[PDB]
Design an enzyme around this catalytic site. Structure first.
Site, PDB file in Angstrom:
ATOM      1  N   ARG A   1       0.819  -1.208   0.000  1.00 37.08           N
ATOM      2  CA  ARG A   1       0.000   0.000   0.000  1.00 37.08           C
ATOM      3  C   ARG A   1       0.853   1.257   0.000  1.00 37.08           C
ATOM      4  O   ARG A   1       0.470   2.236  -0.643  1.00 37.08           O
ATOM      5  CB  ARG A   1      -0.985   0.010   1.163  1.00 37.08           C
ATOM      6  CG  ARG A   1      -2.321  -0.591   0.780  1.00 37.08           C
ATOM      7  CD  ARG A   1      -3.037  -1.220   1.940  1.00 37.08           C
ATOM      8  NE  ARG A   1      -4.359  -1.689   1.543  1.00 37.08           N
ATOM      9  CZ  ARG A   1      -4.606  -2.849   0.950  1.00 37.08           C
ATOM     10  NH1 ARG A   1      -3.636  -3.699   0.660  1.00 37.08           N
ATOM     11  NH2 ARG A   1      -5.860  -3.164   0.638  1.00 37.08           N
TER      12      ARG A   1
ATOM     13  N   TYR B   1     -21.128  -6.233  -8.335  1.00 42.05           N
ATOM     14  CA  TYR B   1     -21.067  -7.368  -7.415  1.00 42.05           C
ATOM     15  C   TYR B   1     -22.213  -7.338  -6.409  1.00 42.05           C
ATOM     16  O   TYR B   1     -22.805  -8.381  -6.113  1.00 42.05           O
ATOM     17  CB  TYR B   1     -19.707  -7.403  -6.725  1.00 42.05           C
ATOM     18  CG  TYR B   1     -18.578  -7.424  -7.724  1.00 42.05           C
ATOM     19  CD1 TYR B   1     -18.481  -8.456  -8.649  1.00 42.05           C
ATOM     20  CD2 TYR B   1     -17.631  -6.408  -7.767  1.00 42.05           C
ATOM     21  CE1 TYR B   1     -17.465  -8.492  -9.576  1.00 42.05           C
ATOM     22  CE2 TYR B   1     -16.604  -6.434  -8.700  1.00 42.05           C
ATOM     23  CZ  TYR B   1     -16.531  -7.482  -9.599  1.00 42.05           C
ATOM     24  OH  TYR B   1     -15.524  -7.529 -10.532  1.00 42.05           O
TER      25      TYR B   1
ATOM     26  N   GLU C   1     -23.700 -11.224 -14.789  1.00 43.56           N
ATOM     27  CA  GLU C   1     -22.978 -12.029 -13.813  1.00 43.56           C
ATOM     28  C   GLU C   1     -23.922 -12.955 -13.050  1.00 43.56           C
ATOM     29  O   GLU C   1     -23.541 -14.083 -12.708  1.00 43.56           O
ATOM     30  CB  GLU C   1     -22.209 -11.121 -12.857  1.00 43.56           C
ATOM     31  CG  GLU C   1     -21.404 -10.034 -13.554  1.00 43.56           C
ATOM     32  CD  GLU C   1     -20.038 -10.517 -14.003  1.00 43.56           C
ATOM     33  OE1 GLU C   1     -19.614 -11.604 -13.558  1.00 43.56           O
ATOM     34  OE2 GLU C   1     -19.389  -9.809 -14.801  1.00 43.56           O
TER      35      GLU C   1
ATOM     36  N   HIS D   1      -6.817 -16.711 -17.162  1.00 48.07           N
ATOM     37  CA  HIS D   1      -8.099 -16.336 -16.568  1.00 48.07           C
ATOM     38  C   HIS D   1      -9.252 -16.900 -17.393  1.00 48.07           C
ATOM     39  O   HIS D   1      -9.243 -16.779 -18.623  1.00 48.07           O
ATOM     40  CB  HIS D   1      -8.216 -14.819 -16.471  1.00 48.07           C
ATOM     41  CG  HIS D   1      -9.435 -14.351 -15.738  1.00 48.07           C
ATOM     42  ND1 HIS D   1     -10.648 -14.150 -16.360  1.00 48.07           N
ATOM     43  CD2 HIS D   1      -9.627 -14.045 -14.432  1.00 48.07           C
ATOM     44  CE1 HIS D   1     -11.534 -13.740 -15.472  1.00 48.07           C
ATOM     45  NE2 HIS D   1     -10.940 -13.667 -14.294  1.00 48.07           N
ATOM     46  N   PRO D   2     -10.244 -17.533 -16.765  1.00 52.90           N
ATOM     47  CA  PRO D   2     -11.379 -18.072 -17.529  1.00 52.90           C
ATOM     48  C   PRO D   2     -12.277 -16.957 -18.045  1.00 52.90           C
ATOM     49  O   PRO D   2     -12.739 -16.112 -17.274  1.00 52.90           O
ATOM     50  CB  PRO D   2     -12.107 -18.949 -16.503  1.00 52.90           C
ATOM     51  CG  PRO D   2     -11.068 -19.238 -15.452  1.00 52.90           C
ATOM     52  CD  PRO D   2     -10.300 -17.957 -15.358  1.00 52.90           C
TER      53      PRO D   2
ATOM     54  N   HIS E   1     -20.225 -21.626 -14.731  1.00 54.12           N
ATOM     55  CA  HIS E   1     -20.437 -20.178 -14.711  1.00 54.12           C
ATOM     56  C   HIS E   1     -20.207 -19.576 -16.101  1.00 54.12           C
ATOM     57  O   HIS E   1     -21.020 -18.783 -16.600  1.00 54.12           O
ATOM     58  CB  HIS E   1     -19.503 -19.570 -13.658  1.00 54.12           C
ATOM     59  CG  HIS E   1     -19.659 -18.096 -13.453  1.00 54.12           C
ATOM     60  ND1 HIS E   1     -19.138 -17.157 -14.316  1.00 54.12           N
ATOM     61  CD2 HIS E   1     -20.259 -17.400 -12.458  1.00 54.12           C
ATOM     62  CE1 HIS E   1     -19.418 -15.946 -13.867  1.00 54.12           C
ATOM     63  NE2 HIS E   1     -20.103 -16.066 -12.744  1.00 54.12           N
ATOM     64  N   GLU E   2     -19.108 -19.971 -16.751  1.00 50.94           N
ATOM     65  CA  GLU E   2     -18.782 -19.437 -18.071  1.00 50.94           C
ATOM     66  C   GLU E   2     -19.747 -19.969 -19.125  1.00 50.94           C
ATOM     67  O   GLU E   2     -20.076 -19.257 -20.081  1.00 50.94           O
ATOM     68  CB  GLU E   2     -17.328 -19.744 -18.441  1.00 50.94           C
ATOM     69  CG  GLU E   2     -16.281 -19.163 -17.481  1.00 50.94           C
ATOM     70  CD  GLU E   2     -16.108 -17.653 -17.571  1.00 50.94           C
ATOM     71  OE1 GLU E   2     -16.614 -17.028 -18.526  1.00 50.94           O
ATOM     72  OE2 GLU E   2     -15.463 -17.084 -16.666  1.00 50.94           O
TER      73      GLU E   2
ATOM     74  N   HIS F   1     -10.083  -3.262  -9.816  1.00 50.66           N
ATOM     75  CA  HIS F   1     -11.258  -2.655 -10.443  1.00 50.66           C
ATOM     76  C   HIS F   1     -11.233  -1.131 -10.389  1.00 50.66           C
ATOM     77  O   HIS F   1     -11.565  -0.466 -11.378  1.00 50.66           O
ATOM     78  CB  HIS F   1     -12.526  -3.190  -9.781  1.00 50.66           C
ATOM     79  CG  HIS F   1     -12.647  -4.679  -9.844  1.00 50.66           C
ATOM     80  ND1 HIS F   1     -12.112  -5.512  -8.885  1.00 50.66           N
ATOM     81  CD2 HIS F   1     -13.217  -5.486 -10.768  1.00 50.66           C
ATOM     82  CE1 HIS F   1     -12.363  -6.768  -9.207  1.00 50.66           C
ATOM     83  NE2 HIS F   1     -13.033  -6.781 -10.345  1.00 50.66           N
TER      84      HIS F   1
ATOM     85  N   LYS G   1     -14.830   2.560   7.143  1.00 51.09           N
ATOM     86  CA  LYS G   1     -14.462   1.147   7.224  1.00 51.09           C
ATOM     87  C   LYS G   1     -14.742   0.581   8.607  1.00 51.09           C
ATOM     88  O   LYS G   1     -15.187  -0.566   8.737  1.00 51.09           O
ATOM     89  CB  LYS G   1     -12.994   0.961   6.846  1.00 51.09           C
ATOM     90  CG  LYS G   1     -12.589  -0.491   6.677  1.00 51.09           C
ATOM     91  CD  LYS G   1     -11.133  -0.612   6.287  1.00 51.09           C
ATOM     92  CE  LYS G   1     -10.911  -0.261   4.829  1.00 51.09           C
ATOM     93  NZ  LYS G   1     -11.513  -1.270   3.914  1.00 51.09           N
TER      94      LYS G   1
END
Ligand SMILES: *[C@@H]1O[C@H](CO)[C@@H](O)[C@H](O)[C@H]1NC(C)=O
Ligand SMILES: *[C@@H]1O[C@H](CO)[C@@H](O)[C@H](O)[C@H]1NC(C)=O
Ligand SMILES: *[C@@H]1O[C@H](CO)[C@@H](O)[C@H](O)[C@H]1NC(C)=O
Ligand SMILES: *[C@@H]1O[C@H](CO)[C@@H](O)[C@H](O)[C@H]1NC(C)=O
Ligand SMILES: *[C@@H]1O[C@H](CO)[C@@H](O)[C@H](O)[C@H]1NC(C)=O
Ligand SMILES: *[C@@H]1O[C@H](CO)[C@@H](O)[C@H](O)[C@H]1NC(C)=O
EC number: 3.4.17.23
Lengths: 596, 198
Positions: A151, A497, A384, A327-328, A356-357, A487, A463
């Site tokens: 970080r 999400y 998704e 990565h799929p 999923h794919e 992201h 947070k």
């Protein structure tokens, strides 16, 4: 003659000359992904530039048709989609600066290497050098060092860049008739012109808060249980009254809690539902995995895969000589060409990923009848969600017994259900406060509610208040702690999400109700039910032609996102956690009680 | 499909059983006559129209259909007697770069008449504004190329379509089916059919 006919002919002209160009761009991208060579990179760049230039020219031509004289919903939706300026409204100097900033952030994140001071001969990258350390170490100072060092370097490099980025994005968004960049992101769920099914940009934040308020008791109980288990694992660091340390969540950023399943297992003595050994013993190839997934989709009533899918997909790692992205990813190349690029191994995770794919592929196939510019999901959440429902259904013990992967005499007692539900909660429920806090913080930053000098003081305060995670040591304004995630640094929306998670369980309840399942929601399998597949396919065929509210009415019978299916899914786990938290204290204190 | 080839077949014997028994054809839909009795009947002339269309556009080659191909490219009459034969041609008509040699008429002011060929290359006028000969805004070129790749789906793969049109006119019919001779048997009382004399 009329404006509507002119727009319809123009849209036909666009779809015809845009499908081929999109196919060329997608094919170039596929060739780059399956074969990483410099000529493939050049071809991808050329195709992307041609695609972008063609889109700019078509948008420029499209703006000359006024929106108010078109009454057809599909034509109006395509014209609204095409007429968006995007970055075009901004000046060329600022646009070039924004593009350069995005590219340099991508390079800094992708090629960021950080290692311990005094030993600089070799350093470790984030993947997989730092991921394994974050996911598997049990040492406090090592995890603290890795978290703080990464970080420190990434935030100190990215803080001026992020300060420029927020200003440029706000300038572009205000130039595009939006309040801020947050309003631009919230405009995806905006429905206008449909009577009764209208959804506003302002309503999204209120709905997210209203759902999260009901999420909060379950998250508080889960947080208390995880806190108690981490206190058992680490005796002195975690306080009974305070928040969890940031570097102990099992991942680099806290996105998922799935790496704490070993530490936080309810019944370690009991076995798992792992089916990897059964596939290894029976020599199950990746082709067999995809064939079983195809059998599941024909079982539920969806169309089976095309010949082009089987012939052109790469479902195994090619070899040492040929490099490919691991990565799929499911690719809808255009013109009925659907492929899956996944380096499939003999694991349960790869099997669920294959489902999923293939769900993504089924969703892409369903809206092929629609016009080209409407060939997408109604919103970012649905696309998704339709993969996640297949992931949920395939992982059930009933599905494993049906396909022969699990023993027919396996005893399904309450303990296995409790531990499995806890693992699903750690993966699915745990991401929701982090996602909500990050999106709300970004929306406040874009809106100007939080000044640049006060970004972190509010953020940690958020947070502690929302995520229940405390900073190990105080951070000043030289750090850029949010931008360490993939992201946010690469200009991607993060609320997908949260919407996906709520839509996932709403769809799961709808299909299980359609399939006449009479037991617990988590024990439901959607195989062998034609009606459930038909109900799903009714929404699937629409694509982006209809508002997401109407699609949600079609599937679950509600005009708004709902939080009750998630709570219903985890209700046995909720009762178990409430029983187990009698001695412990539910909830956390925002003070610096554990460490600071 | 915009410039579909028409071949007039006359003064020969047409063997339809070779076409019917082939397994290489995806569509063998006959309208107005049945394939079984084609090998016996006789017709004055046969019109063979040949063109290439997409997989999803084979359905539009029928009487009463609506689409880009039916309205603007190839129009079939309602009172049509003949057979529509279509087969997949991904092997020959698709190349890796893209085969753009096949064009279709995308826009026309009015629908085509049955068995009409339009080879005009005049700019389509979609707006009141004078096109002025240049393809700019609201004025588009009517003939659009087709994209054929070997990795495309079955609904986008090239399909070769041959439409046979059978008409009977007052003139003597000369395209006759192949009558099949039997073996000759002598010295017995048999029913003889020699050249139509029984
Ligand atoms: C990958 O690229 C190399 C580079 O020349 C080429 O020789 C090879 O045939 C390619 N393989 C595939 C599957 O495209
Ligand atoms: C809107 O346009 C599509 C295609 O352009 C057409 O099929 C549909 O019938 C139109 N809807 C209305 C209500 O006219
Ligand atoms: C796009 O920008 C141009 C000028 O920058 C403006 O005239 C036009 O109205 C914008 N498009 C929309 C849909 O607002
Ligand atoms: C897919 O389904 C069709 C129709 O049900 C069938 O003819 C075809 O053989 C199937 N393909 C595979 C690979 O099973
Ligand atoms: C599971 O069921 C048994 C039998 O009713 C009970 O004794 C046990 O406490 C249950 N365990 C959980 C975790 O619910
Ligand atoms: C669903 O159908 C398949 C195919 O017959 C069958 O093998 C399977 O057992 C069925 N599922 C259940 C739960 O019976």
């Amino acid at each position: 003659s009329t404006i509507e006919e002119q727009a319809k002919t123009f849209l036909d002209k666009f779809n015809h000359e845009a499908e081929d160009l999109f196919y060329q761009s997608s094919l170039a991208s596929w060739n780059y992904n399956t074969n990483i060579t410099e000529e493939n990179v050049q071809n991808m760049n050329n195709a992307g530039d041609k695609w972008s230039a063609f889109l700019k020219e078509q948008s420029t031509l499209a703006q000359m048709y006024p929106l108010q004289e078109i009454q057809n919903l599909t034509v109006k939706l395509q014209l609204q989609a095409l007429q968006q300026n995007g970055s075009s409204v901004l000046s060329e100097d600022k646009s070039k600066r924004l593009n350069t900033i995005l590219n340099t952030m991508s390079t800094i994140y992708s090629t960021g290497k950080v290692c311990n001071p005094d030993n600089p001969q070799e350093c470790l990258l984030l993947e997989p050098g730092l991921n394994e350390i974050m996911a598997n170490s049990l040492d406090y100072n090592e995890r603290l060092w890795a978290w703080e060092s990464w970080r420190s370097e990434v935030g100190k490099q990215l803080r001026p860049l992020y300060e420029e980025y927020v200003v440029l994005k706000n300038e572009m968004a205000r130039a595009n008739h939006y309040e801020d960049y947050g309003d631009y992101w919230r405009g995806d769920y905006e429905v206008n012109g449909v009577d009764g099914y209208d959804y506003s940009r302002g309503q999204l934040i209120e709905d997210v808060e209203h759902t999260f308020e009901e999420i909060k008791p379950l998250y508080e109980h889960l947080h208390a249980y995880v806190r108690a288990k981490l206190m058992n694992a680490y005796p002195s660091y975690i306080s009974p009254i305070g928040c969890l340390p940031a570097h102990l969540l099992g991942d680099m950023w806290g996105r998922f809690w799935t790496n704490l399943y070993s530490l936080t297992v309810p019944f370690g003595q009991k076995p798992n539902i792992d089916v990897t050994d059964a596939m290894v013993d029976q020599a199950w190839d990746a082709q067999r995995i995809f064939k079983e997934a195809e059998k599941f989709f024909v079982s539920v009533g969806l169309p089976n895969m095309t010949q082009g899918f089987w012939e052109n997909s790469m479902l195994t790692d090619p070899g040492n000589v040929q490099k490919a992205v691991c990565h799929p990813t499911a690719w809808d190349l255009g013109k009925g060409d659907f492929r899956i690029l996944m380096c499939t191994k003999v694991t349960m995770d790869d099997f669920l990923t294959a489902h999923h794919e293939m769900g993504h592929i089924q969703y892409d196939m369903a809206y092929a009848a629609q016009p080209f510019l409407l060939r997408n999901g109604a919103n970012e959440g649905f696309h998704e969600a339709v993969g996640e429902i297949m992931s949920l259904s395939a992982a059930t013990p009933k599905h494993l017994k049906s396909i022969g992967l699990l023993s027919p005499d396996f005893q399904e007692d309450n303990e296995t259900e409790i531990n499995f539900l806890l693992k699903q909660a750690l993966t699915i429920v745990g991401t929701l406060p982090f996602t909500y806090m990050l999106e709300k913080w970004r929306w406040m930053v874009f809106k100007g509610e939080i000044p640049k000098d006060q970004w972190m003081k509010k953020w940690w305060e958020m947070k502690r208040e929302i995520v229940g995670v405390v900073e190990p040591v105080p951070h000043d304004e030289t750090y850029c702690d949010p931008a360490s995630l993939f992201h946010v640094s690469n200009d991607y929306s993060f609320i997908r999400y949260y919407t996906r998670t709520l839509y996932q369980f709403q769809f799961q309840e709808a299909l299980c109700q359609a399939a006449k399942h009479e037991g617990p929601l988590h024990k439901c399998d959607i195989s062998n039910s034609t009606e459930a597949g038909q109900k799903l396919f009714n929404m699937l065929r629409l694509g982006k032609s209809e508002p997401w509210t109407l699609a949600l009415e079609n599937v679950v019978g509600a005009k708004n996102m709902n939080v009750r299916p998630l709570l219903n899914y985890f209700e046995p786990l909720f009762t178990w956690l409430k029983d187990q938290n009698k001695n412990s204290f539910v909830g956390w204190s925002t003070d610096w009680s554990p460490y600071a | 499909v915009y410039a579909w080839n028409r071949k007039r077949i006359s003064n020969c014997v047409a063997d339809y059983s070779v076409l019917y028994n082939s397994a290489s054809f995806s569509t063998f839909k006959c309208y107005g006559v049945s394939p079984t009795k084609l090998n016996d009947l006789c017709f004055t002339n046969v019109y063979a129209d040949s063109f290439v269309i997409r997989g999803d556009e084979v359905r539009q080659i029928a009487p009463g259909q609506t689409g880009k191909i039916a309205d603007y490219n190839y129009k079939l009459p309602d009172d049509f007697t003949g057979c529509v034969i279509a087969w997949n041609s991904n092997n020959l008509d698709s190349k890796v770069g893209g085969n753009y040699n096949y064009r279709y008429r995308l826009f026309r002011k009015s629908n085509l008449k049955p068995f009409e060929r339009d080879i005009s290359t005049e700019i389509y006028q979609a707006g009141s504004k004078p096109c002025n000969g240049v393809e700019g805004f609201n004025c588009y070129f009517p003939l659009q190329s087709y994209g054929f790749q070997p990795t495309n789906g079955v609904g986008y793969q090239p399909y070769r379509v041959v439409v046979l049109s059978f008409e009977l006119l007052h003139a003597p019919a000369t395209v006759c089916g192949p009558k099949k001779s039997t073996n000759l048997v002598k010295n017995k009382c048999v029913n003889f059919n020699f050249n139509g004399l029984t």
